[PDB]
Amino acid sequence: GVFTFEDEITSTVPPAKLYNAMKDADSITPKIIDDVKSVEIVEGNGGPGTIKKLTIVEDGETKFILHKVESIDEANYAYNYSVVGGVALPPTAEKITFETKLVEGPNGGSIGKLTLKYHTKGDAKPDEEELKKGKAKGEGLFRAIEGYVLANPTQY
Incomplete structure (x- = not known):
C-alpha cells in the first residue's frame, strides 16, 4: 500500500536559493554528509527518470543506494526523488x-513541506522505526543543502 506523511519545516534561506541548491545535490551531499562518498548517474541527464547510485559507508563498510529522480517543478519550487534500492x-x-516543496516564508526565509511516501508490498504497513529513520533521512538531506548554502553564500 502507499502511506503518506507530511511535515512542515522552516529555513532562513529564501526558496529560490534552496531550490537551486536542491538541484545541486549530487555535488553538495557528498561534501557535507560524511557517510555519503559519491553520487553517480546510471541513466539519464539529471531530469525526471534519472537513476543515480550513491556510495555510502556505514561503520566502515561500503554500501550502495539507488535513487530515481521523480519530478522537478520550478513552478512550485519542488524536487522529488525516490529510494528504489539499498539498505x-x-x-x-x-x-x-x-x-520537498518550498514557499516564501515571513522575514526572507522559506516554508518547506517534506512528504514521505512509504510504498509497502501488498497488505503490509510501514515499520515504526523504519518510518522514523526515513523521516530523519529526508530531514538530514534538506539540512545538508541548507547547510551548504549558509556556509557558501556567494554561490546561490
Whole structure:
C-alpha cells in the first residue's frame, strides 16, 4: 500500500536559493554528509527518470543506494526523488519517495513541506522505526543543502 506523511519545516534561506541548491545535490551531499562518498548517474541527464547510485559507508563498510529522480517543478519550487534500492528497502518495503516543496516564508526565509511516501508490498504497513529513520533521512538531506548554502553564500 502507499502511506503518506507530511511535515512542515522552516529555513532562513529564501526558496529560490534552496531550490537551486536542491538541484545541486549530487555535488553538495557528498561534501557535507560524511557517510555519503559519491553520487553517480546510471541513466539519464539529471531530469525526471534519472537513476543515480550513491556510495555510502556505514561503520566502515561500503554500501550502495539507488535513487530515481521523480519530478522537478520550478513552478512550485519542488524536487522529488525516490529510494528504489539499498539498505532502506526491507522486503515489505518497495520504494520510499521523498518530496520537498518550498514557499516564501515571513522575514526572507522559506516554508518547506517534506512528504514521505512509504510504498509497502501488498497488505503490509510501514515499520515504526523504519518510518522514523526515513523521516530523519529526508530531514538530514534538506539540512545538508541548507547547510551548504549558509556556509557558501556567494554561490546561490
